[PDB]
């Protein structure tokens, strides 16, 4: 039951943030790299569970031709690794049903928010900047979900990063992302 996928990676994988621009939910991948939303635009430090940590290196993923992905890569300073989950993270951007919103901040503590269908969107304008490769799901997300991990049938698809009061948009996630060989 994909409750169990969800709850592990609540538990082993995402983590309670705050920046400057507010709370989120961040998704630890392996090691010590994790991902943000871009727009949570992290700075030298982050609470991650209320403890200061030291980001040792942060990158806005773009696309071949330089396009916003929305989302932000960061090598952070902490003690243990991360349950490397990059092999549940697919190669090519699939649609998904029965998917699960996995969310974990103050504003919106541990919760998983069944979304139903996720299916490629793409073009999408953000705050005025272009972005491609965003999904779409038929939920009306709200205030302090942003970061949220979608999850469906043990795969971990998207990060969550907006919504127009009707639907909900996440960025896709691929496994070369987390990968120089692809
Ligand atoms: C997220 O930042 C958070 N902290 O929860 C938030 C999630 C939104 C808020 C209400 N419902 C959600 O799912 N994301 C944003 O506020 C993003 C952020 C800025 C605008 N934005 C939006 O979601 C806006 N709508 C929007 O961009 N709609 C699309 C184009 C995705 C259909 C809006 C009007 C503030 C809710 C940026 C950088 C995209
Ligand atoms: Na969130």
């Known amino acids: 039951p994909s409750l169990d996928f969800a709850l592990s990676l609540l538990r082993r994988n ?3 943030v705050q920046t400057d621009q507010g709370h989120f939910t961040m998704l630890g991948v392996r090691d010590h790299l994790a991902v943000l ?3 949570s635009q992290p700075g030298k430090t982050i609470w991650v569970e209320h403890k200061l940590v030291r980001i040792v290196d942060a990158v806005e993923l773009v696309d071949e031709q330089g396009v916003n992905l929305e989302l932000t ?7 243990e690794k991360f349950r490397d989950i990059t092999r549940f993270i697919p190669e090519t951007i699939s ?3 029965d998917a699960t919103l996995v969310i974990n901040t103050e504003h919106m503590p541990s919760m998983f928010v069944p979304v139903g269908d996720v299916v490629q969107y793409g073009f ?3 705050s005025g900047k272009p972005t491609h490769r965003t999904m779409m799901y038929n939920f009306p997300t709200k205030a302090g979900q942003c970061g949220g991990v979608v999850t469906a049938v043990g ?3 998207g990060i969550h990063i907006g919504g127009n009061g009707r639907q909900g948009f996440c960025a896709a996630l691929k496994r070369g992302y987390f990968c120089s060989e692809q």
Not at 73 to 79: F, G, M, Q
Request: hydrophobic share 40%; glycine share 0%.
């Open 14 to 16: 995402i983590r309670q």
């Open 37 to 39: 939303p871009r727009h």
């Open 73 to 79: 890569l960061v090598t952070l300073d902490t003690n």
């Open 95 to 97: 649609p998904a049903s």
């Open 124 to 126: 999408l304008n953000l």
């Open 155 to 157: 795969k971990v698809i």
